[PDB]
Structure formats: structure tokens, C-alpha cells
Coordinates of C-alpha atoms and ligand atoms in Angstrom, one line a residue:
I1 CA -3.7 39.5 31.5
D2 CA -5.9 42.7 31.7
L3 CA -9.2 41.8 30.0
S4 CA -10.1 45.5 29.8
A5 CA -7.3 46.1 27.2
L6 CA -8.7 43.5 24.8
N7 CA -11.3 44.1 22.1
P8 CA -14.7 44.0 23.9
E9 CA -16.3 41.8 21.2
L10 CA -13.5 39.3 21.5
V11 CA -13.9 39.2 25.3
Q12 CA -17.6 38.7 25.0
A13 CA -17.2 35.8 22.6
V14 CA -14.6 34.3 25.0
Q15 CA -17.0 34.5 28.0
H16 CA -19.7 32.6 26.1
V17 CA -17.3 29.6 26.0
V18 CA -15.6 30.1 29.3
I19 CA -14.4 27.2 31.5
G20 CA -14.1 28.0 35.2
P21 CA -10.6 27.4 36.4
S22 CA -11.7 24.9 39.1
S23 CA -13.3 22.7 36.4
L24 CA -9.9 22.1 34.6
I25 CA -6.9 20.2 35.9
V26 CA -3.8 20.9 33.8
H27 CA -1.3 18.0 33.9
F28 CA 1.8 20.3 33.5
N29 CA 4.1 17.2 33.7
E30 CA 2.4 15.6 30.7
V31 CA 3.4 17.7 27.7
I32 CA 1.9 16.9 24.3
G33 CA 4.1 19.4 22.5
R34 CA 5.9 22.7 22.8
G35 CA 7.0 25.3 20.3
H36 CA 8.3 28.9 20.3
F37 CA 5.0 30.5 21.1
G38 CA 2.8 27.8 22.5
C39 CA 2.7 24.6 24.5
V40 CA 0.1 21.8 24.8
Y41 CA -0.6 19.7 27.9
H42 CA -2.8 16.8 28.8
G43 CA -5.7 17.9 31.0
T44 CA -8.8 16.7 32.7
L45 CA -12.0 18.7 32.3
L46 CA -14.9 18.0 34.8
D47 CA -18.4 18.4 33.5
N48 CA -21.4 19.3 35.6
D49 CA -22.0 15.7 36.7
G50 CA -18.4 15.2 37.6
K51 CA -17.6 13.2 34.6
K52 CA -13.9 13.5 33.7
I53 CA -13.1 14.5 30.1
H54 CA -9.6 13.9 28.6
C55 CA -8.6 17.1 26.9
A56 CA -5.6 18.9 25.4
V57 CA -4.8 22.2 27.0
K58 CA -3.1 24.8 24.8
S59 CA -1.2 27.7 26.5
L60 CA 1.0 30.6 25.4
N61 CA 4.5 30.8 26.6
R62 CA 4.4 34.6 27.1
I63 CA 1.5 36.9 27.8
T64 CA 3.2 40.3 27.7
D65 CA 2.2 41.3 24.1
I66 CA -1.5 42.3 23.6
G67 CA -1.3 41.3 19.9
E68 CA -0.2 37.8 20.7
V69 CA -2.8 37.3 23.5
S70 CA -5.6 38.7 21.3
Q71 CA -4.5 36.5 18.3
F72 CA -4.4 33.4 20.5
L73 CA -7.9 34.1 21.9
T74 CA -9.1 34.9 18.4
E75 CA -7.8 31.5 17.2
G76 CA -10.0 29.8 19.8
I77 CA -13.0 31.9 19.0
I78 CA -12.7 31.2 15.3
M79 CA -13.4 27.5 15.9
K80 CA -16.1 27.9 18.6
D81 CA -19.0 27.3 16.1
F82 CA -17.3 24.6 14.1
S83 CA -19.8 21.7 14.5
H84 CA -18.9 18.9 12.1
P85 CA -17.7 15.3 12.7
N86 CA -14.5 16.0 10.6
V87 CA -13.6 19.3 12.1
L88 CA -11.9 19.8 15.5
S89 CA -14.2 21.3 18.0
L90 CA -13.5 23.7 21.0
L91 CA -14.4 22.6 24.5
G92 CA -13.9 26.1 25.8
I93 CA -11.4 28.7 27.0
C94 CA -10.2 28.9 30.6
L95 CA -9.4 32.4 31.8
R96 CA -7.1 32.4 34.8
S97 CA -6.3 35.3 37.2
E98 CA -2.6 34.5 36.6
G99 CA -0.9 33.2 33.5
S100 CA -1.9 32.4 30.0
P101 CA -5.5 31.8 29.0
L102 CA -6.0 28.1 28.1
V103 CA -7.6 26.8 24.9
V104 CA -9.2 23.5 25.7
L105 CA -9.6 20.8 22.9
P106 CA -11.0 17.3 23.0
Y107 CA -8.2 14.9 23.2
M108 CA -7.2 13.1 20.0
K109 CA -5.8 9.7 20.8
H110 CA -3.8 9.2 17.6
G111 CA -2.3 12.7 17.3
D112 CA -1.8 14.2 13.9
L113 CA -2.6 12.4 10.7
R114 CA 0.9 12.7 9.2
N115 CA 2.6 11.0 12.1
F116 CA -0.1 8.4 12.2
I117 CA 0.3 7.3 8.6
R118 CA 4.1 7.4 9.0
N119 CA 4.0 5.0 12.1
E120 CA 5.0 1.6 10.7
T121 CA 3.1 -0.1 13.6
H122 CA -0.2 1.0 12.0
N123 CA -1.3 -0.8 8.8
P124 CA -4.0 1.3 7.1
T125 CA -5.1 -0.1 3.7
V126 CA -5.3 1.9 0.5
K127 CA -9.1 2.1 1.1
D128 CA -8.5 3.3 4.7
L129 CA -6.1 6.1 3.4
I130 CA -8.6 7.1 0.8
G131 CA -11.2 7.2 3.6
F132 CA -9.0 9.6 5.6
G133 CA -8.9 11.8 2.5
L134 CA -12.6 11.6 2.1
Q135 CA -13.1 12.7 5.7
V136 CA -10.8 15.7 5.2
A137 CA -12.8 16.6 2.1
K138 CA -16.0 16.5 4.1
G139 CA -14.6 18.7 6.8
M140 CA -13.3 21.1 4.2
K141 CA -16.7 21.1 2.4
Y142 CA -18.2 22.2 5.7
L143 CA -15.6 24.9 6.3
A144 CA -15.9 26.2 2.7
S145 CA -19.6 26.5 3.2
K146 CA -18.9 28.9 6.1
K147 CA -16.5 30.8 3.8
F148 CA -13.6 29.8 6.1
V149 CA -10.2 29.6 4.3
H150 CA -7.8 27.3 6.1
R151 CA -4.4 28.5 4.6
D152 CA -2.4 25.6 6.0
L153 CA -4.2 22.4 5.1
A154 CA -1.7 19.5 5.4
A155 CA -1.7 16.1 7.1
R156 CA 0.4 17.5 10.0
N157 CA -2.4 19.8 11.0
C158 CA -5.3 17.3 11.0
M159 CA -6.0 15.1 14.0
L160 CA -7.2 11.6 14.4
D161 CA -9.4 10.5 17.3
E162 CA -9.8 7.1 19.0
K163 CA -12.3 5.9 16.4
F164 CA -9.9 6.9 13.6
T165 CA -12.1 9.8 12.7
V166 CA -10.1 12.6 11.0
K167 CA -10.7 16.1 12.5
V168 CA -9.5 18.9 10.2
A169 CA -7.6 21.4 12.4
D170 CA -4.7 23.8 12.5
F171 CA -2.5 22.0 15.0
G172 CA 0.5 24.2 14.0
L173 CA 2.9 22.3 16.1
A174 CA 5.4 21.9 13.3
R175 CA 4.8 25.6 12.4
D176 CA 5.4 26.7 16.0
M177 CA 8.5 24.6 16.1
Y178 CA 9.8 26.3 12.9
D179 CA 9.7 23.0 11.0
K180 CA 11.7 23.0 7.7
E181 CA 8.4 22.9 5.7
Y182 CA 7.8 26.6 6.5
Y183 CA 9.9 29.1 4.6
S184 CA 10.2 32.9 4.8
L185 CA 4.7 29.9 4.6
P186 CA 4.1 26.2 3.9
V187 CA 5.3 26.6 0.4
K188 CA 5.2 22.9 -0.8
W189 CA 1.4 22.9 0.0
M190 CA 0.7 26.3 -1.6
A191 CA -1.1 27.0 -4.9
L192 CA 1.0 28.7 -7.6
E193 CA -1.0 32.0 -7.3
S194 CA -0.5 32.0 -3.5
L195 CA 3.3 31.5 -4.0
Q196 CA 3.2 34.6 -6.1
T197 CA 0.7 36.8 -4.2
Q198 CA 0.6 35.3 -0.6
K199 CA -3.2 35.5 -0.9
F200 CA -5.3 32.4 0.0
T201 CA -8.7 31.2 -1.1
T202 CA -10.9 28.1 -0.8
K203 CA -9.5 27.2 -4.2
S204 CA -6.0 27.4 -2.9
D205 CA -7.1 25.2 0.0
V206 CA -8.1 22.8 -2.8
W207 CA -4.5 22.8 -4.1
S208 CA -3.3 22.0 -0.6
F209 CA -5.9 19.2 -0.3
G210 CA -4.4 17.6 -3.4
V211 CA -1.0 17.6 -1.7
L212 CA -2.6 16.1 1.4
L213 CA -4.0 13.3 -0.8
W214 CA -0.5 12.7 -2.1
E215 CA 0.7 12.6 1.6
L216 CA -2.0 9.9 2.3
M217 CA -1.1 7.8 -0.7
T218 CA 2.6 7.8 0.2
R219 CA 2.0 7.2 3.9
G220 CA 3.5 10.6 4.8
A221 CA 6.4 11.1 2.5
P222 CA 7.7 14.7 2.2
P223 CA 6.5 16.3 -1.0
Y224 CA 9.2 17.3 -3.5
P225 CA 12.0 15.9 -1.3
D226 CA 14.8 16.9 -3.6
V227 CA 13.4 20.5 -4.0
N228 CA 14.3 23.1 -1.5
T229 CA 11.5 25.4 -0.2
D230 CA 12.8 26.9 -5.2
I231 CA 9.3 25.4 -5.4
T232 CA 7.8 28.2 -7.5
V233 CA 10.4 27.9 -10.3
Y234 CA 10.1 24.1 -10.1
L235 CA 6.3 24.1 -10.6
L236 CA 6.5 26.7 -13.4
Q237 CA 8.8 24.4 -15.4
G238 CA 5.7 22.3 -15.9
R239 CA 5.8 19.9 -13.0
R240 CA 3.6 18.2 -10.5
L241 CA 4.0 15.6 -7.8
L242 CA 4.4 12.1 -9.3
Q243 CA 1.7 9.5 -9.0
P244 CA 2.4 7.3 -5.9
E245 CA 2.7 3.5 -6.7
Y246 CA -0.5 2.6 -4.8
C247 CA -2.5 5.7 -5.8
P248 CA -5.4 4.7 -8.1
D249 CA -5.5 6.4 -11.5
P250 CA -8.8 8.2 -10.8
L251 CA -7.4 9.6 -7.5
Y252 CA -4.3 10.9 -9.3
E253 CA -6.6 12.5 -11.8
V254 CA -8.3 14.2 -8.9
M255 CA -4.9 15.4 -7.6
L256 CA -4.1 16.9 -11.0
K257 CA -7.5 18.7 -11.0
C258 CA -6.7 20.1 -7.5
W259 CA -3.5 21.5 -9.0
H260 CA -5.1 23.1 -12.0
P261 CA -3.1 26.2 -13.0
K262 CA -6.4 28.2 -12.9
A263 CA -7.8 28.4 -9.4
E264 CA -11.3 28.9 -10.8
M265 CA -11.1 25.5 -12.5
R266 CA -10.2 23.5 -9.5
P267 CA -13.1 21.3 -8.2
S268 CA -15.1 22.5 -5.2
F269 CA -14.8 20.5 -2.0
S270 CA -18.4 19.4 -2.6
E271 CA -17.3 17.9 -5.9
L272 CA -14.3 16.3 -4.3
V273 CA -16.4 14.6 -1.6
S274 CA -18.6 13.2 -4.3
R275 CA -15.8 12.0 -6.5
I276 CA -13.7 10.5 -3.7
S277 CA -16.8 8.8 -2.2
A278 CA -17.2 6.9 -5.5
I279 CA -13.5 6.0 -5.7
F280 CA -13.6 4.8 -2.1
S281 CA -16.7 2.7 -2.7
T282 CA -14.8 0.6 -5.4
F283 CA -12.5 -1.0 -2.7
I284 CA -13.5 -4.1 -0.8
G285 CA -11.2 -3.2 2.0
Ligands
5IE1 O1 -7.1 23.9 15.3 C1 -7.2 25.1 15.5 N1 -8.0 25.9 14.7 C2 -8.7 25.3 13.6 C3 -9.6 24.3 13.9 C4 -10.3 23.7 12.9 C5 -10.2 24.2 11.6 F1 -10.9 23.6 10.6 C6 -9.3 25.2 11.3 C7 -8.6 25.8 12.3 C8 -6.4 25.8 16.6 C9 -5.6 25.0 17.5 O2 -5.0 25.6 18.4 N2 -5.6 23.7 17.3 C10 -5.0 22.7 18.0 C11 -5.0 21.4 17.5 C12 -4.4 20.3 18.1 C13 -3.8 20.5 19.4 O3 -3.3 19.5 20.1 C14 -4.0 18.4 20.4 C15 -5.4 18.5 20.5 C16 -6.1 17.3 20.8 N3 -5.4 16.1 21.0 C17 -4.1 16.1 20.8 N4 -3.5 14.9 20.9 C18 -2.2 14.5 20.5 C19 -1.8 13.3 20.8 C20 -0.5 12.8 20.5 C21 0.3 13.6 19.7 C22 -0.1 14.9 19.4 C23 -1.3 15.4 19.8 N5 -3.4 17.2 20.5 C24 -3.9 21.8 19.9 F2 -3.3 22.0 21.1 C25 -4.4 22.9 19.3 C26 -5.9 27.2 16.3 C27 -7.0 27.1 17.2

């Protein structure tokens, strides 16, 4: 890539988080995932004392289009100041003389939250699953305070580390693989007004958060499984996702608030953290 062709403010932001190529070993044989535009590898990052850091290394598959390269770098820069225990952080960006720039992320042992809760070899309790939802709300409360709108909040895009801490993220692996849940947009997670206008706000992130809570309470069931990505007509008939069998009544009430037909009337993520903290606290385990 020719750095001189990129936006100079973007390049300057990249240089503030640059990783020198000799500090990063990309394990090209160890693929975490691959889609149409991107690929993710395991990597080893060496810090100044020689400590080895297990990381995920994201690359583009092609670097010929300046728009794609700029957008890819911009995605990394957007997260460089995210500093919160429930938001994925950026280790840095490795610029190489040949090939794609590399976006370097701390490695998340348990992958994405959706596949984690779907894995029958794990046995999270109802309280544990509510806790995951509380952690997402805390990360979203932080992001909303920065006026950041996520636009694709869903269990598939959040990560889980080795301590089972949820990191809100925009993994986008299913998106980049053209997963069925994206239609032309993640319509089964979208607020009614975004289905109609394709505009997104923090209050439409709240709608998506309600769907994510439903994902947690069903251990990763697909929402509206007998509805094709028809969802706008379906909702306007007067419908919502049904209450999962093990979803507490107050948490379903929270879901229905998240899906209020008026975006202005949906609870803030600050309110959601408070309410879900209380519900979580009623469980012994
Ligand atoms: O998240 C992003 N932006 C953002 C962040 C916060 C936020 F609030 C809003 C948006 C971006 C991004 O590229 N994310 C990304 C997320 C995970 C990735 O894969 C990772 C990473 C770390 N460990 C694993 N492990 C793993 C293990 C087993 C199975 C599967 C995965 N995969 C990856 F390569 C990239 C656009 C920049």
C-alpha cells in the first residue's frame, strides 16, 4: 500500500498505534476465520520485555482498492480509544512494506458469545447468562457515553475471554461470510424505524440489545426462525419474540421495553445496567 494516498489524519492516527513488523509473528497456518473481505490468524506479539502475547491478527484479502484499505484502517482506529472491561480493545496496527496492514486484537479464548452459549459442552446457569447480558449492557453504556452507535449488536459479534468476560465487539465474521442473517443488514436485530429508514441510533442499539438478551435466554436460538429475513411486515402485525421458558418475567419486561415502538421511549443503557443488575442479584447461582 502507498500511505501517501490515504487520508493524512487517518495515517497519523495509525502511526500512534503502530506495531513494528518484527514484533509480530503471524501464524498463517492457524486460521481463526476467513470471509469474503477479511481473514483472522492466530499471532504472537512480543512486548518490550520479550513477553509473548497471544493475539488475533486480522488482514484484508485484497489491498488494491483505496476505499477498502481506508475503511479497514478506519475500523481499527475507531476502537483505539475504547478502554472498558466489556469492550474489545486494540493492541495495535502493523503496517508492512508488502501486503495488507494487520489489525491486532487480544486473543479471546472462547470466541464469540453466540457460539459459546450454543456449545452444549458448556453449562452456564440462568444467572450466568443474565450476567453475560449485564456485561454487554455495561459495554454499551460506555459506548453510548462516547456517542458511538454500534449498528450490529448481536451475540455473534461479542467476544468472550478466558475469564468469561464479555467484550462487546464487531467481529463481523458471519457478516463477512455472507451469513443468512444479513439481507439486502442484520434485519432480525434491527429496530422497526431502522428497517424503514436504514438509519441507526443508540436507541436502535437498545432494540438489538433486547434481541441479544433473547439470544442469551435461549442459549443461542435463531430469532424468528420461521420468518424469512418479511420481518418488517411480521413485526407490524403486532408481534414480538416470545418469552423464553427460562427467561424471568422481569427480564422479558425489559426485552419488551427495548422493543418499544417509539425509539425515544426505550430505556437507556444506563437504565438497563441498573435494572439488569437488580434482576441478576436475585439469583443464588
Ligand atoms: O471489533 C471491531 N470493532 C469494534 C470493537 C468494539 C466495539 F464496541 C465496536 C466495534 C473490529 C474488528 O475487526 N473486530 C474483531 C473482533 C474479533 C476478531 O477475532 C478475534 C479476536 C480475538 N480473539 C478471537 N478469538 C476467537 C477464538 C475462537 C473462535 C473465534 C474467535 N477472535 C477480529 F479479528 C476482529 C472492526 C474493528
